[PDB]
Amino acid sequence: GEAARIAAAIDAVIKGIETKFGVSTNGVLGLKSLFTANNYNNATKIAGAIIEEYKPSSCLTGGSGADNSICPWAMENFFAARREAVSMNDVIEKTVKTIVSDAP
Amino acid sequence: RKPSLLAHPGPLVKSEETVILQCWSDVMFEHFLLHREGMFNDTLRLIGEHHDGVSKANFSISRMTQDLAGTYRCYGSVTHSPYQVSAPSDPLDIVIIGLYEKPSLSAQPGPTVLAGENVTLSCSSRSSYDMYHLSREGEAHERRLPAGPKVNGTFQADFPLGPATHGGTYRCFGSFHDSPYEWSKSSDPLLVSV
Ligand SMILES: *[C@@H]1O[C@H](CO)[C@@H](O)[C@H](O)[C@H]1NC(C)=O
Ligand SMILES: *[C@@H]1O[C@H](CO)[C@@H](O)[C@H](O)[C@H]1NC(C)=O
């Protein structure tokens, strides 16, 4: 029922984040804690957790040894993306907005 | 080659005040990457303005906020090798001032001395700051000394300036190890006259 609809949209967000950023949420405690009925649609919380766990700004020097999985995305979409200042954290938030909206 | 990171008018910014972080180099970098390391790390991709044989880019903070304070560093890139970024610039700490009690700056033996006289500026406060910063107007290198004695219920850091050679207006700040980008209200400027 609605419980099934909730899990369907949560999995869509999880799959969306993983395929768009080229990362895996397996073992990622901060992100998995937010995959709930209320916290799975808050783009601000998810964007903040991706930055906290995957440390995208650390990809400037190759990444934090703890998780350099987001670096291919960071390089393609920010550091070597092909005027005004562009914030890395803004780009991440804007990407999460599209994943959440195109999830259904 | 290592770019240069500057703050205009300076790295010591007041809350809600404006500051411009300038990234520049003699090497023609098409893009500049400004990294902030602090409570909320972020990287900004600035477009390089090639002019006068120097490439430069500005990052303007219209209203200074706590989340924007931190250690900034500039990296340079060229569309030729977009994956090979330059060595970072020397770190620039953007500090928010005016958050704690204004310390008191006094001169010993006095604020007006004959050349060759040993002067020692004394920074004091009721608050137990972990560090005191003595700034000479014009100079960028601030002097940090923890507190030595305790006088009249106030902790004090005494900065010996050695024999007098030239004058200057000095200011004083206090900081805490746990809040590194938040400093005290500036002390009232003390004019030393040799
Ligand atoms: C959604 O995120 C915002 C910003 O953090 C905040 O209102 C709160 O964390 C969340 N609101 C909810 C779940 O109602
Ligand atoms: C000033 O201090 C120096 C270094 O301690 C020492 O020679 C002496 O105390 C003073 N010398 C003067 C007044 O020239």
Residue numbers in the entry:
A (entry chain A): 165 to 246, 254 to 275
B (entry chain B): 27 to 220
Task: Reproduce text from the manuscript describing this model.
For RBK21, the variable region (residues 148–299) was mixed with the KIR2DL1 ectodomain and crystallized. The variable regions of both RBK21 and KEN-01 consisted of a helical bundle that presented extended loops and short helices at the KIR-proximal end. In both cases, the KIR2DL1 binding site was formed from two helices and two loops, which contacted the D1 domain of KIR2DL1, with a conserved binding pose despite only 53% of the KIR2DL1-contacting residues being shared. The binding site was centred around a conserved hydrophobic core, with L224 and F242 from each RIFIN occupying a shallow hydrophobic pocket containing residues L59, Y101 and V111 of KIR2DL1. This was stabilized by an intermolecular β-sheet, which contained loop 4 of RBK21 or KEN-01 and ended with a hydrogen bond linking S258 of RBK21 or KEN-01 and D68 of KIR2DL1. In RBK21, residue S221 was at the centre of the interface. To develop a non-binding mutant of RBK21 for future studies, we produced S221R. This abolished binding to KIR2DL1, as shown by SPR analysis, despite circular dichroism indicating that it adopted the correct fold. Inspection of the RBK21–KIR2DL1 structure showed that the KIR2DL1 residues, which interact with RBK21, were almost completely conserved in KIR2DS1, except for the conservative substitution of V111L.
